[PDB]
Every structure is written in C-alpha cells, then in structure tokens.
C-alpha cells in the first residue's frame, strides 16, 4: 500500500497488511484458527487458570489501547496519543485471574456468561524469527449478567504466538487498538 495515495491508511496498518499478502500458508491459517478457537473456548467457560497455563507465554505483553480523537490534519500536538486499558505482563494477568476467581468478587455472583465469536483469522510466520507466528483475528465478545445486562465488544487483535513449554504455541503479544473511544459497556473487564 502506498499511504501517500491511500490517504486514510496509517503506516502501521500498511505494514501489517504486507505481512499476510506474502507467503500464504493454508496449513498455518488452520493451525491459527484452532489455536484461537481453543483459547476462546477456555475463556468462555471462565477457565482462566487453564487459559494462562495453556495459552499465555511467560514473556507476554497483553495490551489494549484507547486512542485520543485527534484531527486527521493534526501535525503539531505531540502529547501521549493513547492510554493503556490493558498493558499486562504474565504476573499482571495472573493478578487479574486471581481477582476473577476470588470468592469475594461479589460481581461474579450470579455467574457471568461469555460467548466469543472469532473471525477473519490470518497467519504468517515472522521473517527473522522463524519461531514467531503472527496471527490476526477479529472478536465479537458478548457478556451477559444479572438478568438484563448485556455488553458486546468488537475488536481486531494483532497477536504474536511462539512455541513454549512442551512445544505448545502460546501468546507472547496481543495488541488491540479499541475502536470505540467512549465505552458503552460499563467497563472493559473482559479478556479480548
């Protein structure tokens, strides 16, 4: 993509497109789909410890940002463009998991209901680290609780996955640029 011509495209987005339009491997797309479907299943049934153990690498960065709305023509204002809704290492994810599992987390009674829809899976091996797998996918996440509370989240996920203990591919980076600036879901207390 020529971003001087395609005026609405960011350099980052153009870079990410390039990585998937190259070596298409059908088998890798399928592996990626299985990996993400199993991850989503563990999360949906709230098996958060199993998710950590089976899906999340010790060196993980798990990051969801919220970008301040700026003018398309803006070129002078150069202060922090985004904040981190999440920016977690493994221990920080573990804290969040223990918070979910704590029997005095009053908000988790009655039990929440999660349903995740994972689509648009793309996969490509890194060029310089043949053990690093880039996976892109989109998620719709439905959270229902307390009779009539319903919150639906929508996001694109830029992941890196790498083989870890026992040869199991695990998440080493997830990056989400959350598309809604003001959340209308009470909070973002879900693992995208």
């Amino acid at each position: 993509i020529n971003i001087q011509e395609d005026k609405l495209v960011s350099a980052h987005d153009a870079e990410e497109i390039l990585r998937f339009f190259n070596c298409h491997d059908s088998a890798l797309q399928q592996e990626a789909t299985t990996l993400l479907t199993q991850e989503a299943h563990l999360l949906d049934i709230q098996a958060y410890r199993a998710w950590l153990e089976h899906c999340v690498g010790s060196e993980v960065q798990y990051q969801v940002i919220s970008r301040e709305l700026r003018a398309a023509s803006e070129r002078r204002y150069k202060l922090n463009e985004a904040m981190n809704v999440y920016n977690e290492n493994f221990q920080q994810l573990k804290v969040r998991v223990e918070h979910q599992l704590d029997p005095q987390n009053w908000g988790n009674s009655p039990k929440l209901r999660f349903t995740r829809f994972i689509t648009n899976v793309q996969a490509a091996m890194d060029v310089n680290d043949k053990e690093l797998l880039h996976i892109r996918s989109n998620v719709i996440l439905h959270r229902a609780r307390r009779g009539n509370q319903v919150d639906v989240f929508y996001a694109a996920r830029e992941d890196k996955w790498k083989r870890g203990e026992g040869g199991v591919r695990k998440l080493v980076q997830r990056f989400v640029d959350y598309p809604e600036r003001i959340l209308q879901t009470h909070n973002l207390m879900v693992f995208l």
């Binding site: 969801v64 009053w106 909070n187």
Partner: protein, 446 residues
Amino acid sequence: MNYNNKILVSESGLSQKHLIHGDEELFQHELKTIFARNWLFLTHDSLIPAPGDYVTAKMGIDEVIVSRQNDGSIRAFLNVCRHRGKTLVSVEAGNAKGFVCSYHGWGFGSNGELQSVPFEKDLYGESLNKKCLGLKEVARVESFHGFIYGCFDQEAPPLMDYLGDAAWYLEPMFKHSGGLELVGPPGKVVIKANWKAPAENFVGDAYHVGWTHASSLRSGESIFSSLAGNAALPPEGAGLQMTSKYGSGMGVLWDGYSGVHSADLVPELMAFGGAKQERLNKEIGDVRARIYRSHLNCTVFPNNSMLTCSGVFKVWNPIDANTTEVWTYAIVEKDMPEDLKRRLADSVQRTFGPAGFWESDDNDNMETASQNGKKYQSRDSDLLSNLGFGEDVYGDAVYPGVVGKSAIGETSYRGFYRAYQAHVSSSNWAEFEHASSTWHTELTKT
C-alpha cells in the same frame, strides 16, 4: 417539586432522600444550581502547554473548548457555532489558531472571536457585527497548581476560596512536591449511576474498602491490603476525615504513599515518597510533609475526585440521573523519573481505568444504589450518613475544616450533602452564602 422547601438532605447532612440519585427533574435542576454555578474540572497545564493547544471538556452536559492563548492564559468557550448552533470541534485535543465550522464555514479564533465569514463582503456587506458574535465564553477559568477549573457563574468565589479548608490538605502534594502533571489521554466509560454515587464514595467512603474491594485487596497485594474482607480494622490514628464550607472533602490515610498500586511498585514508591518527605519536613513542617505522602481520597465539589499517591484522577460527567461518563486520568509528580511516571500511569489505569479491577468492584454498588432511587417504594426512603456524627470538630489547632479524627466515618458525606442542599435550595451564590453562614456548627452538633 419545590426545591426551596423540599428537605432532600436532613439537618447536619445526616440523611438524604434516595430519590436524589434517580429523579430526572432534580437532575435538570442540578444543571442550573450545581453545574452552572460551581467550579468544574477542565484540564491541566500539562495537556495544553503551548499556545494554540486545546482540548474539549464537559461542564455538566455542556461541552467546551479549552484553549491556551498566545499570552499564556487559558480561555474556554462553548463548543457551539454562533451561526446555527453546530458543534464546532469534533476532536478531543489538538493545536490550532482557530476553529472553522463545517456547516457554513465561519472561522473563530483560539480567543473565541468570530474572525472570518465566507464571502462576508458579498453576502453580509458591512451588516454583520462580528464583535458580538464571539463564542459563548466560560466566565471564570482559574488554576490550582496547574489544574484548570471553569465556572459559568461570574459570581462564584475564587477557586482557592472555594476549595476552602480542603486546600490545606492538597497543597503538600499539589504545590510543595514541586508540582504534578496530568497524564492523558483519559480513559472514558459510561456507567449507569448518578454522578453523586461515585462523588460521595471518593469524598468520604473508607468504610466500603475492605468489603467492596476484598478481591482486589487480596489479589493485588497493595499497601492497604490488610483490609481484605474486613479481616482487619485500621488502628486508631490511622487517619482522619475532613470537609469544608463549599462541599469539598477528603479522607486521609496516614503514610499510604503506594496506595492501591500492586506490590510491583510498592518499594519504589515508598522510597520516593519517604525521601521527598524528609526534604519537606524542613520546609513545611513534619505534619504537612507527612500529609504529602499520605493517601487522600478527595472530591472537589461537585464532580471531580482523586486518590493522591495512588494517582487516580476522576471526572464524573453527568448525562442523566442514572448515567455518568467517567473520565480517568493519572497524576504523577513532575520530578519522578520518567520510567516511574510511565509505570505509575499504567497502574492507575490497571486499577481504576476502563478495565480497572478495583473500579469494577464499585460498579454494581453505584449503579444499583442509583437505579433504586427511581423505584417507587424507595424514592422517599432515607440514605444514611450518620457514622461519626457528634464526634466531629471544627477549628482544630493542627487539622483545619470540619474534621473527624478517625480513618473511617461519614464526616465528608455530611459536608458534601450540606453544601449540595444549600445550592439546590438557592437561586444564586448570595443565597448559598446565607444558607451556609453556620455551616460548621450544623456539622458538629451533638
């Protein structure tokens, strides 16, 4: 409802009618008597430091443009075109010398002046009086150590006087620390609660911490963690509560400089705060130097709250009686190492941001308490804030304001709601003053 006569808050602030969290007519009345009258948080110097820098902010339900002028001052204006009322600015921050309306192209300066009108000569000739067509300006804009507040009412007290006795408590961290910076952009989330629910919670609710935040206390390993599940009561002398004439108040938890931050930041913070405290002893005295590194849960009346040391900074922007848009910034001390500021900012959002696990503990409490205010059998019921009543003092030799010398109580609820009722039943500042001439006596009865 006759707001002159209706007792929404009982004498001494001891109780409030539950309807205050649900009644839409009262919400509309608050737009006039609370939000159009009082000081509201806009931004910080650190977010608009250079000429032309601007942000948008809410003031009640209104939106304003807040702009750094060429002379270094800040002016704020309604984000509404003077022609046919279109929203002028659609972004949250930027830098510009002016703002052009996308409807008919009128151009306003950063100073609010109508500077240009397309084809003015051919269309209006000399008939358009642009001098009278400047953006509607926020009458009062003042700073408290870089923190910029606005007020639509020209008759308001100066910001410093409005902070009243609360200013003394804020100064060690806001002034004597060398100054604070606000780290943006803020998180923004809508909750289904009345703005008063989180405002009252931050102003004076230490009681809820051990029980509401049991899971966050147990999981995060922060310095206040012994409270988890009401396993332990803070010792005597662990802190105090205060409130003031114009409604602002706070709790003080002695020495709690690492606040809600997880164990990963505790040693670094406790060293940093302790080191600055030792320097401040010589400048502002031991007590005030200690207050600097003590955890303050504060509401600046009506709807700006903060946890100092934790570094949480909140605006509870009103939408309707059961809807509030929560803005969450981080505050950091300017002279902290940059890497520490970055981690502190992330930790503020980790704990109290859009996915803040502590903040999530409060959701159901504030949403249901607010929504119950609409329910028929609860409208005329009494919300209680009598904990510690009869033990508050005023005019203490060391700690100013109406003060409860205990870490947990409802002193600050009482002062918050006393001021709230005085405003709701008054038509202007002069009437508020008349209704407040015995404010501390009312609060210290029995």
